Structure formats: C-alpha cells, structure tokens
Nucleic acid binder design. Structure first.
Length: 163
RNA sequence: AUUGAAAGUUGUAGUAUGCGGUCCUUGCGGCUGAGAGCACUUCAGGAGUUGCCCGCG
C-alpha cells in the first residue's frame, strides 16, 4: 500500500489536498483505496504507485485547463478561475500556476518552487501574520506547487459553492 | 502575567397613514279554564216561682 502521507498545514487546506488525492487517483485507477481521517491529517491508503497518480493528476488538470480555455491573460468564469477567486489578480494567477504544474508534469519532472495560497482554499490564511509585535511584509504562508494544484482540483471537482 | 497584551459589530430608524360589520325586518294572525250544583235535612232556652213579709199624721 502506498499509504501516501499528507502535509499538515490547515484542516481545511489539508482536507482539500488529501481529498483531491482521490480524484487524482480515480482517473488513473487505484482501486480498493480508503481515506482515514486524523482530525486534520486526513491520511490516505492506496495500492497505487507514483506514476499512475501523476497520470491521473495530469488528466484531471488537463480537463481543468480544457474547461478554462473554453471561456476568456485569459480570465474565464470558472470555479477555479473567477467563480471562487475573490481577488482579480488570482483570476489570471491560478490558471498560470495550473499550466506551469502541467508543463513540469508531463516531462516527468518534479516541482522546484512554492506559491502563495489564496484565502479561497483556506480561510485560515491571509496576507499578514502576527509574529511578536507586528506583521510581515508580503504573505508569510506559502505551499508547494503540486499540493496547491491538487487541492485546487479537489475543490473544483467536489466542493459545492454558490455565488 | 499564558502569541497573550490594546479593542462596542458601533452609532441614527413609528409598519405607518385614511377604513360604519353597514343598509330593510310585527314573534305576526285565530282561541269561552266553560257547561251541571239546596249548607241542605231534625230542633221549646226549657222546666220550678207571693215584692217576700210588721204599719193610728
């Protein structure tokens, strides 16, 4: 069993990533899988290796980008583009991140950077953070590119939202 | 003196204004508590009895 571990950041963001795990898995197969919750970790047990996981994830994000291009720096009225991205700059930021994740992904190459998580995928985050007696410039909270993209896929494929 | 320390989810706001439970209406007309009827029939205030007794204008 893969029993792939899931990073502990936020039981809302952690839910999104560990729960888009399954949608990335189903498109590549990975039968007889289960999701054990640990309060916030949300570990997953599966008999899958990494390559089928990656093929499923890239298939999901390929459908995602195909849906994105259907409407239009391209801004589409999609859940992951403008339906849930409350910020105007994220309307363009998210699709570019998704396509960069793809371009890194079909060539069998792991990611090498990190990206800022909007408040949409986790309301616990934000712009600032109180360190001792004040805040930091910019956004202290950042997440891995693959986790960010896969949490976006999980949010777009499962969780309902109304505008 | 606890990642706690400072902090109104705050101030102002009428469901309010005019709107008939209203106009017409017999508890109405006819009706014998009436006809027959002995307080009637028998009946003694009744039976006894010295104004009594004496008398010179």
């Amino acid at each position: 069993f893969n029993e792939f571990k899931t990073p502990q950041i936020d039981p809302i963001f952690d839910l999104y990533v560990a729960y888009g795990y399954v949608v990335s898995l189903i498109r590549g197969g990975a039968k007889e899988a289960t999701l054990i919750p640990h309060g916030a970790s949300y570990l997953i047990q599966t008999d899958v290796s990494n390559e089928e996981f990656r093929h499923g994830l890239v298939d999901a994000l390929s459908s995602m980008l195909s849906l994105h291009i259907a409407l239009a720096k391209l801004v589409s009225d999609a859940d992951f583009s403008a339906g849930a991205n409350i910020n105007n700059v994220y309307w363009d930021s998210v699709p570019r991140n998704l396509e960069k994740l793809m371009k890194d992904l079909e060539k069998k190459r792991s990611v090498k950077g990190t990206a800022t998580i909007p408040i949409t995928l986790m309301p616990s985050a934000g712009k600032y953070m109180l360190k001792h007696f004040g805040v930091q410039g910019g956004n202290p909270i950042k997440v891995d590119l693959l986790n960010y993209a896969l949490a976006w896929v999980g949010f777009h494929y499962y969780t309902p939202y109304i505008k």
